[PDB]
Design a protein around this nucleic acid. Structure first.
Ligand SMILES: [Mg+2]
Ligand SMILES: [Zn+2]
Ligand SMILES: [Zn+2]
Lengths: 55, 98, 67, 52, 170
RNA sequence: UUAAAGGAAUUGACGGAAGGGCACCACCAGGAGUGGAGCCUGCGGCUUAAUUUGACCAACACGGGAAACCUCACCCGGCCCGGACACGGACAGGAUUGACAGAUUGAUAGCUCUUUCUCGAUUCCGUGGGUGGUGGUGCAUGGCCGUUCUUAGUUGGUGGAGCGAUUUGUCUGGUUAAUUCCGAUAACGAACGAGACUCUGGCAUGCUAACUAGUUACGCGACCCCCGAGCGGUCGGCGUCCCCCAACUUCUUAGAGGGACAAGUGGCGUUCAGCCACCCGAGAUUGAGCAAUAACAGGUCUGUGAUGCCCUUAGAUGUCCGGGGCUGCACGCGCGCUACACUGACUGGCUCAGCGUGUGCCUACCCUACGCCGGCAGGCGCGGGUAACCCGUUGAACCCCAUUCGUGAUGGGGAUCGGGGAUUGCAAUUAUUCCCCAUGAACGAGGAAUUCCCAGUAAGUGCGGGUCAUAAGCUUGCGUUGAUUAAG
């Protein structure tokens, strides 16, 4: 607690802040176009966004 | 949790007049966007609706990452009695559309 | 899983069972035992605290200097 | 791969959106009867301003 | 706010369709959900369910639409009453693979055997005018090592592009 | 002393068993080379308070992991409860929060302590309890991926053969990229897999269309002109959708459709399937995506509120905060850059592209033109661009011509290493990056062994995404230059 040093780190530039949109993977995500998904989850939601396969 | 009593009224007054609210599972997030006026933080919105599940009053699931909420039948009548409200002030789940 | 240097315990409070901060004389006469907090919300609402030489409002957080 | 083990595969999700264009000189109350004529989820049509 | 570019319009409404898919799958699992279709209007916008049982997705005087629309409103940022859902009975209940997989969930969570459950849903689809269909039930069966059952029945294509729209996976 | 040994047929796997076919994850013929040298990076080992961890053809530039702190588990230390709910006591004659001063500490942590105010039943304690977990177990599992497995295979029904497992079907051959076809026939009839299909690459001087793409024509502007003429040369100079003060589609963008099918001619073979070149033609094998049955005790519980059980639960494996480590070096191993010059390297000229990304509900910080200050890195103001609308005809490198250097460990190589300058940021120290001057090591074509590939192909050569605040020797795409050798 005690707000002065509670969240005192800069959660900014760098991978301490870039979270996955789905359920917060912080290892190897995609900042492109505002997808902001974990790459493990991009095959779960490939057909649903509009990122269909190689054609 | 802390339960500041003028601020539980702040979160109960909207969770009663509509049966929905949209907290997002990140606790170090400074401001709740839907209330936005009575300087309440994201954390108690979990830690008061934890208390509304565990009595048996509200019911929730889990989104991708957000929380949703739906009132039970027991949760409806208890909260108007909690806020000193009659059985004419009603939640928005009975009938609001035409 | 031993930790022999003994980390400190919980913040236990004052718990002293005596308030009595309005002395009564001459069949009813009022005494502010401590100075009141001169803030812009709590004039004669609360008591400004009293250390042995300094004063500091416990709520509104302004201070009275070292004298 | 959801792990790091495999034999080095790389799939290429490519999305290709197309676009066309049409002018008008017409008054824009009947721009409303240009919009509301197909329900059609598979279009994204945009209304350019009629200030000229 | 001020408007944004076109390549991120198309992942905005893409990720809009993916999220309420995941929520309504968790929300309407026990009612035979089977997907949603969106319509965007610059007015009151328009969404439909494809539910098997249009009973439970309705409330009394529409309760499980009006709170199932308000969380749609109050999450993304749709304005004051600009969105509406609808229940809709999906034609040939035993032909979209997601629906009865949600309904054979409760044939396994109901407490039957897996072999009564698999053959029961297999004959149903067959008698609902199917050309070929299969079910694989994989996991921890009777025993300790997880071995898998499959019940391929009829004829089925697997390769090329026509395994995109002649088939539905679940 | 022991529950099998032993017989005969069947399906697989195997054989340094025979026959027949295929593959540059195989060879022959050849090139690029790694292994030799410097280095960046990965793994083991040793060392450490910790050097967290997974994997040993299908591990070793892999965990889309190029970590300054965050992320992060590991180590050293300081806080917080973010332990819901149910049970009783402590709660009105003194339960629970917060906080200035100071010896408090890493610390403006009220952590503790002295002193002492404030908060308002929220709680605290006792007990049962969820809970959280980048805590274990991928040999409890789901999803997914990897592989034998990119090679041509797999299966019922129904008959026949058989006590029976099983088998013929699924074949002697001919042919084919291929159980691909012909045909041969106790088998007949079918399904996948292949193919087809989708994308892409190539011709459409055909069709439809163009103030966000252009061409041609014209009027103006400017220069040049033997001479002095201009329907002469140059112009990405200006204007021709602004209410017509021009048309048009070759080049740009797509959209439909057309196009090649092994069709024609010959030689072959059972004039069967087909093969061999030739003629027409843009093209007579464009390249990849998807991909079967049945499986591995393949990997991942550290993507996941996918998850069973166990462990841990406030002196927490939860979680915040500062520092250290993930980068430490007698050694070895694997990818990869630069090289080792004269077919080179300098210096100055001349020069031609494609692929694509770009300002946010959260998250605040993008592409940059120009102008003016700096010998470079840079700095300020002004703008455009949410984009065929701006960067931008993307003046990339190689190259080419012009000069300097001459076989010298040299102006080749630029490791190592000193000092200074700026940008990034909360922080550059254990050097983030960029720039300067100075320093000038091996390295003189590479042992046994081994990879990759045959047509815009190998290769030299740069640019562009992705990780990004700073960030590419990595990866994934792009175009330029462009081959020797092969049809077995
Ligand atoms: Mg996970
Ligand atoms: Zn006051
Ligand atoms: Zn342990």
């Amino acid at each position: 607690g005690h707000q002065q040093l509670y969240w005192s780190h800069p959660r900014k530039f760098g991978q301490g802040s870039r979270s996955c949109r789905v359920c917060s993977n912080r290892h190897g995500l995609i900042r492109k176009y505002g997808l902001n998904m974990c790459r493990q989850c991009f095959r779960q939601y490939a057909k649903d966004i509009g990122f269909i396969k190689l054609d | 949790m802390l339960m500041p009593k003028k601020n539980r009224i702040a979160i109960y007054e909207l969770l009663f007049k509509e049966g929905v609210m949209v907290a997002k599972k990140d606790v170090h997030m400074p401001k709740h966007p839907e209330l936005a006026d009575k300087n309440v933080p994201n954390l108690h919105v979990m830690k008061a609706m934890q208390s509304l599940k565990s009595r048996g009053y509200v019911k929730e699931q889990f989104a991708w990452r957000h929380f949703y909420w739906y009132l039970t039948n027991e949760g409806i009548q208890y909260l108007r009695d909690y806020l000193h409200l009659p059985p004419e002030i009603v939640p928005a789940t009975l009938r609001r559309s035409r | 899983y031993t930790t022999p240097k003994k980390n400190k315990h919980k913040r236990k409070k004052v718990k002293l069972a005596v308030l009595k901060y309005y002395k009564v004389d001459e069949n009813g006469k009022i005494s502010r035992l401590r100075r009141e907090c001169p803030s812009d919300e709590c004039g004669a609402g609360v008591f400004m605290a009293s250390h042995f030489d300094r004063h500091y409002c416990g709520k509104c957080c302004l201070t009275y200097c070292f004298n | 791969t959801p792990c790091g083990e495999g034999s080095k595969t790389w799939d290429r999700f490519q999305m290709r959106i197309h676009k066309r264009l049409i002018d008008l000189h017409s008054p824009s109350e009947i721009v409303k009867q240009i919009t509301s004529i197909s329900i059609e989820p598979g279009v994204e049509v945009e209304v350019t301003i009629a200030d000229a | 706010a001020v408007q944004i570019s076109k390549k991120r319009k198309f992942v905005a409404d893409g990720i809009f369709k993916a999220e309420l898919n995941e929520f309504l799958t968790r929300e309407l699992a026990e009612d035979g959900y089977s997907g949603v279709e969106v319509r965007v209007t610059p007015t009151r916008t328009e969404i439909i369910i494809l539910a098997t049982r249009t009973q439970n997705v309705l409330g009394e005087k529409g309760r499980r639409i009006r709170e199932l629309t308000a969380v749609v409103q109050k999450r993304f940022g749709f304005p004051e009453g600009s969105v509406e859902l609808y229940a809709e009975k999906v034609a040939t209940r035993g032909l979209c693979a997601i629906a009865q997989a949600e309904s054979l969930r409760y044939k396994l969570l109901g407490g039957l055997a897996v072999r009564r459950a698999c053959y029961g849903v297999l004959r149903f689809i067959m008698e609902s005018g199917a050309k070929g269909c299969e079910v694989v039930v994989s996991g921890k069966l009777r025993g300790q090592r997880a071995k898998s059952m499959k019940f391929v029945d009829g004829l089925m294509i697997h390769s090329g592009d026509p395994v995109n729209y002649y088939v539905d996976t679940a």
